[PDB]
Write a protein that binds this ligand. Structure first.
Ligand code: ADE
Length: 458
């Protein structure tokens, strides 16, 4: 007997939730986990800031996970969908916590079963609290540890230990502007049209590209002040300063010529067993990761895998259980350098789950997914937001459109298109789409077709 409780709240996004609006519908991502209901024992609870739409659920059941009609009723019986009483735009976990009754219910559910697991994006105070107060152990909670080691500096240190190539820099916090300046002027330079330095605020709260601040050294050498020579600062200066004071930053060289930005995804079992889950080729694309592709490029896939494994081992030693992410850059002829470490699930993870479900099989060998017949599988995954055109659709409508023009993934052919986060369609005009084909080009084409279908009238 298992009980699993799904709260895929984006907690590390304190600002973005109040900006990018389709975020409230983020939790829907968790619907990739329904595969678990294949075990007669597993019981799932889904929590979203906004109610999952019956249509979406139906799609997932039939056209995604391909449940046989006999068992389907049973599967449905072992699934519950719940919404916090708060409809304020805040991290989902927090909202859940605030609803005492909901928490109580969750606890009761957990008790009812042998085993409790909480399924989350990043480990957070709120998630930890929930775990404590419900008797479910977060699958990816461990807040203090995360704080310690998912930080920029910590990540860098881990990378170094692993023997994974990092960009030239220290792994040392810089609690003052002077320190930062010193760090900047003590670097690797290297021939660069516009030689640059980058200061990355150490906290994990600042994940991705809000913390990272970039200064061209020329400007500095003339004017002593950090925020006088900032070529890219996305923080209110004052706030940045405060962060520096209180949490600080770490100093890394800005690699100029970037061709690809691959990603590596790792899982530690509780017995330390590290698994290379997958490798993709993310495309920062303004950092909003408007998507990604699988598998990674043939050249650096194998290389990446080994690196990931090493990192995983290191993390296990350190004592991290759950899931880790390594973000990379490819720097002209200089090669491949690990830039980020993430102590949390990452975008690709959820996509990968869905992909696996579609295929019917797990990632495969040590790398590269393959269908029943053994033939390789390639997917393209994109976030698309078009208030204008998509805001006209509802989940059901979209699904039927996909079915009509034979765009929807069919299991008999082994190629097509599956959507995610369908609830955002009507409300924010947002959707994820993933496209699977026999060749990557084919997959891309399919994706394009889908886009065309959905972002036009009819
Ligand atoms: N050193 C670096 N140069 C350029 N972009 C980066 N993103 C993260 N680290 C970077």
């Amino acid at each position: 007997g298992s009980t699993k409780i799904l709260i895929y709240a984006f907690n590390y996004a304190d600002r973005m939730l109040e900006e990018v609006p389709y975020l409230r519908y983020s939790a829907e991502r968790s619907l990739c986990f329904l595969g678990d209901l294949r075990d007669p024992g597993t019981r799932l609870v889904v929590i979203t800031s906004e109610a999952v739409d019956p249509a979406t659920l139906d799609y997932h059941l039939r056209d995604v996970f391909r449940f046989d009609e006999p068992a389907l009723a049973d599967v449905r019986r072992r699934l519950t969908l719940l919404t916090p009483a708060s409809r304020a735009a805040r991290p989902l976990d927090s909202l859940v916590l605030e609803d005492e009754a909901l928490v109580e219910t969750l606890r009761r559910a957990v008790a009812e079963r042998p085993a409790g697991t909480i399924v989350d994006f990043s480990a957070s105070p709120a998630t930890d609290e929930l775990g404590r107060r419900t008797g479910a152990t977060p699958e990816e909670g461990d807040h203090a540890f995360v704080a310690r080691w998912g930080s920029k500096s910590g990540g860098k240190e881990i990378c170094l230990r692993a023997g994974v190539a990092v960009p030239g820099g220290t792994s040392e916090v810089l609690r003052s502007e002077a320190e930062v300046v010193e760090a900047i002027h003590r670097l690797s330079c290297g021939t660069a049209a516009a030689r640059r330095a980058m200061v990355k605020l150490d906290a994990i709260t600042w994940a991705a590209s809000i913390g990272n601040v970039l200064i061209d050294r020329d400007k500095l050498r003339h004017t002593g002040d950090l925020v006088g020579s900032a070529e890219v600062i996305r923080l209110p200066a004052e706030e940045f300063r405060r962060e520096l004071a209180e949490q600080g930053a770490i100093v890394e060289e800005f690699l100029e010529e970037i061709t690809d930005s691959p990603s590596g995804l790792g899982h530690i079992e509780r017995d330390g067993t590290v698994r290379v889950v997958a490798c993709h080729d993310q495309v920062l694309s303004g950092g909003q990761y408007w998507g990604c592709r699988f598998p990674a490029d043939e050249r650096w896939r194998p290389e990446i895998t080994d690196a990931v494994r090493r990192t995983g081992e290191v993390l296990s030693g350190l004592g991290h259980r759950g899931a880790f992410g390594v973000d990379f850059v490819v720097a002209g002829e200089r090669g491949l350098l690990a830039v980020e470490i993430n102590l949390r699930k990452v975008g690709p993870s959820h996509v990968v789950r869905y992909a696996e479900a579609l295929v019917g099989a797990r990632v495969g060998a040590d790398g590269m997914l393959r269908g029943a017949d053994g033939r390789p599988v390639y997917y393209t995954h994109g976030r698309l937001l078009e208030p204008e055109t998509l805001g006209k659709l509802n989940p059901r409508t979209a699904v039927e459109r996909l079915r009509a023009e034979g765009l929807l993934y069919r299991h008999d052919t082994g190629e097509g298109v599956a959507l995610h986060v369908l609830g955002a369609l009507n409300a924010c005009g947002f959707v994820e789409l993933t496209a699977l084909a026999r060749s990557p080009e084919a997959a891309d084409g399919y994706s394009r077709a889908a886009q065309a279908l959905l972002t036009g009238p009819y």
